Amino acid sequence: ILGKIAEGIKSLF
């Protein structure tokens, strides 16, 4: 999605 916020975070949380 326009934001790249989920580009890498689920694997860390």
From Swiss-Prot:
Sequence intervals crossing the membrane: none
Annotated site (Important for antibacterial activity, and hemolysis activity): 6
Effect listed in the UniProt record for changing residue 7 to K: Similar or 2-fold increase in antibacterial activity against both Gram-positive and Gram-negative bacteria, and little loss of hemolysis activity
Modified residues (Phenylalanine amide): 13
Purpose of the protein: Shows weak hemolytic activity and antibacterial activity against both Gram-positive and Gram-negative bacteria probably by forming pores in the cell membrane. IsCT adopts an amphipathic alpha-helical structure.
Protein name according to UniProt: Cytotoxic linear peptide IsCT
Taxonomic source organism: Opisthacanthus madagascariensis
Shown stretch of the complete protein: 24 to 36 of 68
